[PDB]
Swiss-Prot record:
Belongs to the TAF1 family. The TFIID basal transcription factor complex plays a major role in the initiation of RNA polymerase II (Pol II)-dependent transcription. TFIID recognizes and binds promoters with or without a TATA box via its subunit TBP, a TATA-box-binding protein, and promotes assembly of the pre-initiation complex (PIC). The TFIID complex consists of TBP and TBP-associated factors (TAFs), including TAF1, TAF2, TAF3, TAF4, TAF5, TAF6, TAF7, TAF8, TAF9, TAF10, TAF11, TAF12 and TAF13. TAF1 is the largest component and core scaffold of the TFIID complex, involved in nucleating complex assembly. It comes from the Eukaryota. Component of the TFIID basal transcription factor complex, composed of TATA-box-binding protein TBP, and a number of TBP-associated factors (TAFs), including TAF1, TAF2, TAF3, TAF4, TAF5, TAF6, TAF7, TAF8, TAF9, TAF10, TAF11, TAF12 and TAF13. Interacts with TAF7; the interaction is direct. TAF1, when part of the TFIID complex, interacts with C-terminus of TP53. (Microbial infection) Interacts with SV40 Large T antigen. It is found in: Nucleus. The Bromo domain mediates interaction with histones that have acetylated lysine residues at specific positions. The second domain also recognizes and binds histones that are butyrylated and crotonylated. Phosphorylated by casein kinase II in vitro. Transmembrane segments: none annotated. It comes from Homo sapiens. Coiled coil: none annotated. This is Transcription initiation factor TFIID subunit 1. Signal peptide: none annotated.
Length: 135
């Protein structure tokens, strides 16, 4: 609830202040424009980028670090597929993933608290929704 908002703020500041600050991270800031890279979506079936993650964050898509890190890792996997494992683009995506990991670790204790309280809050909301519906 209130905890979901704090969690999303932390994630968004990790994205804007750490991941987007990686040198030359511009290729991963926004979705690829088909008019500029015409092959991209023929190759990349589950696209992902830092802007889309911010929008998912603002929609409170992420209740835990795990689903957040699923999407962050999709950025890296897509660079590996389209650009190659040894490419400079993939080197940059890997740095983006590492700074994300590093920053989450700094805030592990606080983020673990939030995830716990977010989950117990969502269970309280779901359990009462079902009790209200049958009663
Ligand atoms: C070479 S131009 C270009 N490349 C990009 N990447 C994506 C990562 O892999 C390599 C290459 C395909 C991404 C972009 C933009 S853009 N929206 N112009 O379309 C900002 C998103 N531009």
């Amino acid at each position: 609830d209130d905890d979901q908002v704090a969690f999303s703020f932390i994630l968004d500041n990790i994205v804007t202040q750490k991941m987007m600050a990686v040198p030359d991270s511009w290729p991963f800031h926004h979705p690829v424009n088909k008019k500029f890279v015409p092959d991209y979506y023929k190759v990349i079936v589950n696209p992902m980028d830092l802007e889309t993650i911010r929008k998912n964050i603002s929609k409170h898509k992420y209740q835990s670090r795990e689903s957040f890190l699923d999407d962050v890792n999709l950025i890296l996997a897509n660079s590996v597929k389209y650009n190659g494992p040894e490419s400079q683009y993939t080197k940059t995506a890997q740095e983006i993933v590492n700074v994300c990991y590093q920053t989450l670790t700094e805030y592990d204790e606080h983020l673990t608290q939030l995830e716990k309280d977010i989950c117990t809050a969502k269970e309280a909301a779901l359990e009462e929704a079902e009790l209200e519906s049958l009663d």
